[PDB]
Design a protein around this ligand. Structure first.
Ligand SMILES: CCCCCCCC/C=C/CCCCCCCC(=O)OCCOC[C@H](OCCO)[C@H]1O[C@@H](OCCO)C[C@H]1OCCO
Ligand SMILES: *[C@@H]1O[C@H](CO)[C@@H](O[C@@H]2O[C@H](CO)[C@@H](O)[C@H](O)[C@H]2NC(C)=O)[C@H](O)[C@H]1NC(C)=O
Ligand SMILES: *[C@@H]1O[C@H](CO)[C@@H](O[C@@H]2O[C@H](CO)[C@@H](O)[C@H](O)[C@H]2NC(C)=O)[C@H](O)[C@H]1NC(C)=O
Ligand SMILES: *[C@@H]1O[C@H](CO)[C@@H](O[C@@H]2O[C@H](CO)[C@@H](O)[C@H](O)[C@H]2NC(C)=O)[C@H](O)[C@H]1NC(C)=O
Ligand SMILES: *[C@@H]1O[C@H](CO)[C@@H](O[C@@H]2O[C@H](CO)[C@@H](O)[C@H](O)[C@H]2NC(C)=O)[C@H](O)[C@H]1NC(C)=O
Ligand SMILES: *[C@@H]1O[C@H](CO)[C@@H](O[C@@H]2O[C@H](CO)[C@@H](O)[C@H](O)[C@H]2NC(C)=O)[C@H](O)[C@H]1NC(C)=O
Ligand SMILES: *[C@@H]1O[C@H](CO)[C@@H](O[C@@H]2O[C@H](CO)[C@@H](O)[C@H](O)[C@H]2NC(C)=O)[C@H](O)[C@H]1NC(C)=O
Ligand SMILES: *[C@@H]1O[C@H](CO)[C@@H](O[C@@H]2O[C@H](CO)[C@@H](O)[C@H](O)[C@H]2NC(C)=O)[C@H](O)[C@H]1NC(C)=O
Ligand SMILES: *[C@@H]1O[C@H](CO)[C@@H](O)[C@H](O)[C@H]1NC(C)=O
Lengths: 281, 49, 49
């Protein structure tokens, strides 16, 4: 059971500058006080990044938008998000995003982390969501509408239980999360880093390198992917399941990787602190 | 893995539109269309399971 | 002489001030020669000269 959301204001995509982000540790080797030359699929420096939003600005001329489009995967994806309220929560990767082909579902649903590879029958407009209660101050996850069915499942993994901070917040964005997704020779490689921020409008300029996390043994073809966002619902938001919702405030960025040669700088503790994109100019 | 009347529990893919990349799996049963002859999921002339 | 998880060679093992990230088992010098290892039973970082 799923629903198509119908109250979005029709607005264009935004574009931004990737600056120097997208570097990650290319191998599990300790090096220090050295410059190293490597070749891999990297976000090019100063690349063109597509900027998507989750936001609700009230008023007659409202701009409510909840962007969860299907984007191409190409040769790998640079994904980053900036948020204050745990809105951007997982993705879908596959070729048809339909019941005819196996695809990968990664969902950070309240209290667990779920990774599944199945022939999923996905919703055309998938979402997660949290309802704000009237008789207390708690927020709870109640809406899980990603797929209507699944079968022929493999590689099933569920993490240990935890509590999730589902409370909505105000102020600037607080958490910058960066990921790199690659699909090579049967493996889905995921790199990640979390950085504290206090910025509002766009990706911060700066440099960091992502750590390898995991390498998932999933033998599937990925050509398209979709971002899963959570909705906020409340006693103050009237309407049926297609209109009775509010976008929270969050944003994400998508770039693409290309073969590049880089000069990486490792400091005295083996941390990559800088880099040169040899094809930039 | 052998049976007197044959062991029909083992399968292999014979028809595909392209070759596999290393370590990929595909368990789709979408019927294969051959000979540029449109097929709506039905075994028949130029359409194979 | 030594064998650290399959990596063999010779040299002098000394205690090191290098700190490996949780997923790094071996280090490398400027010419890609191993010059440090993490011991597999007690997780000390040793330099190799
Ligand atoms: C061989 C098979 C390996 C098994 C799988 C191991 C873990 C693989 C998971 C990778 C990324 C999970 C998806 C993140 C959701 C994105 C949006 C999001 O919300 O995530 C970030 C915040 O929530 C996530 C949460 O962190 C909460 C931070 O607020 C943590 O859950 C952890 O999952 C594994 C251990 O339970 C990892 C970490 O998330 C990724 C950062 O490490
Ligand atoms: C959301 O809208 C899509 C159309 O944009 C609906 O999908 C169609 O459903 C009919 C009836 O089953 C099919 O004949 C069409 O071929 C489908 N179109 C596409 C592009 O797939 C979808 O069912 C709606 N979903 C919800 C929950 O309302
Ligand atoms: C990213 O690329 C898009 C094109 O894919 C750029 O947008 C175009 O800009 C020209 C003017 O230079 C307009 O005439 C086109 O109509 C725009 N097309 C679009 C948005 O589809 C965009 O400016 C580039 N952004 C960055 C940050 O480089
Ligand atoms: C988040 O997803 C997990 C995994 O699917 C849910 O936990 C499972 O719930 C079913 C019942 O629906 C049990 O049969 C499983 O044994 C549970 N698995 C684990 C590892 O606990 C969890 O309930 C979901 N979160 C929310 C808010 O619904
Ligand atoms: C805040 O109040 C709501 C009720 O207004 C509580 O939600 C109910 O919890 C019971 C027990 O799990 C369910 O059977 C009801 O169906 C829930 N009601 C609704 C409308 O969802 C909620 O648990 C309370 N918050 C806290 C922290 O206790
Ligand atoms: C994938 O799942 C389907 C179920 O949706 C399995 O369906 C088989 O269908 C044929 C008829 O076309 C039956 O004769 C078989 O008995 C069904 N299988 C089972 C286990 O009951 C299909 O076999 C599954 N394929 C894989 C690779 O797991
Ligand atoms: C390597 O790590 C050491 C700590 O183990 C760093 O030295 C400390 O840096 C903090 C600031 O972040 C100071 O407050 C401490 O007083 C420093 N301690 C000592 C003993 O000097 C060192 O800066 C790191 N080196 C690099 C290149 O990042
Ligand atoms: C991975 O998925 C893509 C997209 O479905 C496959 O490329 C398509 O192949 C069909 C023939 O089966 C062509 O008609 C389409 O024009 C192709 N699309 C594109 C964008 O190239 C690709 O073959 C799949 N990879 C593997 C190993 O099967
Ligand atoms: C057994 O393994 C533990 C953990 O790596 C280590 O601390 C301990 O010294 C090892 N012990 C032997 C050979 O007794």
């Amino acid at each position: 059971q799923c629903v198509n959301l119908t109250t979005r204001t029709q607005l264009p995509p935004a574009y931004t500058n990737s600056f120097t982000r997208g570097v990650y540790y290319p191998d599990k080797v300790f090096r220090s006080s050295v410059l190293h030359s490597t070749q891999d699929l990297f976000l090019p420096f100063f690349s063109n990044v597509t900027w998507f939003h989750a936001i609700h600005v009230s008023g007659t001329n409202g701009t409510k938008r909840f962007d969860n489009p299907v984007l191409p995967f190409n040769d790998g994806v640079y994904f980053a998000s900036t948020e204050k309220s745990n809105i951007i929560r997982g993705w879908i990767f596959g070729t048809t995003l339909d019941s005819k082909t196996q695809s990968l579902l990664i969902v950070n649903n309240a209290t667990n982390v779920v990774i599944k590879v199945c022939e999923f029958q996905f919703c055309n407009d998938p979402f997660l969501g949290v309802y704000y209660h009237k008789n207390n101050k708690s927020w709870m996850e109640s809406e899980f509408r990603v797929y209507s069915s699944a079968n022929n499942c493999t590689f099933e993994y569920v993490s240990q239980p935890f509590l999730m901070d589902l409370e909505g917040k105000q102020g600037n964005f607080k958490n910058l999360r960066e990921f790199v997704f690659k699909n090579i020779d049967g493996y889905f490689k995921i790199y990640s880093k979390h950085t504290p921020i206090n910025l509002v409008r766009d990706l911060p300029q700066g440099f960091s390198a992502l750590e390898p996390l995991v390498d998932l043994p999933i033998g599937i073809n990925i050509t398209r992917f979709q971002t899963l966002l959570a909705l906020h619902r409340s006693y103050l938001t009237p309407g049926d399941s297609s209109s009775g919702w509010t976008a929270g405030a969050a944003a994400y960025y998508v770039g693409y990787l290309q073969p590049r040669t880089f000069l990486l700088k490792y400091n005295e503790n083996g941390t990559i602190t800088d880099a040169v994109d040899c094809a930039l100019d | 893995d052998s049976k007197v009347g044959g062991n029909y529990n083992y399968l292999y893919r014979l028809f595909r539109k392209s070759n596999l990349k290393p370590f990929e799996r595909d368990i789709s049963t979408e019927i294969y269309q051959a000979g540029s002859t449109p097929c709506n999921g039905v075994e028949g002339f130029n359409c194979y399971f | 002489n030594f064998n650290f998880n399959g990596l063999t060679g010779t040299g002098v093992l000394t205690e090191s001030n290098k700190k490996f990230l949780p997923f790094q088992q071996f280090g490398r010098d400027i010419a890609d020669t191993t010059d440090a290892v993490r011991d597999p039973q007690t997780l000390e970082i040793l330099d190799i000269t």
